[PDB]
Design a protein around this nucleic acid. Sequence first.
DNA 1: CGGCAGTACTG
DNA 2: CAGTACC
DNA 3: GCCG
Length: 316
Amino acid sequence: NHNLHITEKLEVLAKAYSVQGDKWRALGYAKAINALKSFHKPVTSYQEACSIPGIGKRMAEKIIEILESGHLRKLDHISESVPVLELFSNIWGAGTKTAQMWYQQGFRSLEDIRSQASLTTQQAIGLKHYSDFLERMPREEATEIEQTVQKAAQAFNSGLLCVACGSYRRGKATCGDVDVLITHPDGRSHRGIFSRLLDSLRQEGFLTDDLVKGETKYLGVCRLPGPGRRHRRLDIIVVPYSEFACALLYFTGSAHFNRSMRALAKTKGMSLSEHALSTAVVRNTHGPGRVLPTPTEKDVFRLLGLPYREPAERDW
DNA sequence: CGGCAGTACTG
DNA sequence: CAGTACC
DNA sequence: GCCG
Ligand SMILES: [Mn+2]
Ligand SMILES: [Mn+2]
Ligand code: NA
Ligand code: NA
Ligand code: NA
């Protein structure tokens, strides 16, 4: 990164915009920040600024002020509330709206929130694991977690396939959570197993808390046996074999890579979701189309006219 | 001017 | 529904 | 915030 002396200061505004709710401006900043990391050279000019895709006028001027100032003006006028809003929004299940309300009501610290704030079932679980959910795990621990789920699932029907996705499948050394995907070749044996599997994982204490118990998506908390173990976020998604490849790619990410893929699909009258790549094409103000067969991840890249990127290179 | 994704819970 | 979360 |  040739521009850490520029990105460091923009990351402060970005996070300030996101916690304050300005989600589009925050996105715009984020793009620009990743662009300058991607760049090969230090930015040297206002026109070298506008040259980058993702850097426009307004942020060209800010890099311009920084490149002489050595520091930016706007940073001195950040509202005093940003650090508190960030602290609150880092509770799982609490977003920008809940944090700003808590701030309006005078809350200023997690002791205040524990003391006086009403919390949803999800937020109380998030607060209780506030530190654990902020730290990443070694990828080897992600492997035990996948294997724990896999042996539980394969006991019922051994035809079942189980794959950890997310940053783990992208080959990163540490993982924020574990995203386990499940399907069955016979195309029907995948259905109605959350009953038995989550009961089995809950049997000897692997599952500790449930955040979301949908019919296809489970989000929750797990912990491995023995000393030194922290509580880890675990998600489980069960899909029809038809949608295996598309789910495989969505839940491996990354989120910016998924977003770029969706954008290119839109250039070609197609739509990409976790369920399917579709020729749903009508776009003139904003009637779906046809799901195209994608037995493998390769097919999605292919029908989109891209060369196959293996998971490790989608870590955008 | 207006999209930047869609989908699934929760209450 | 608004809010939040998943990548 | 950017960009068409
Ligand atoms: Mn993940
Ligand atoms: Mn813990
Ligand atoms: Na540009
Ligand atoms: Na949160
Ligand atoms: Na996850």
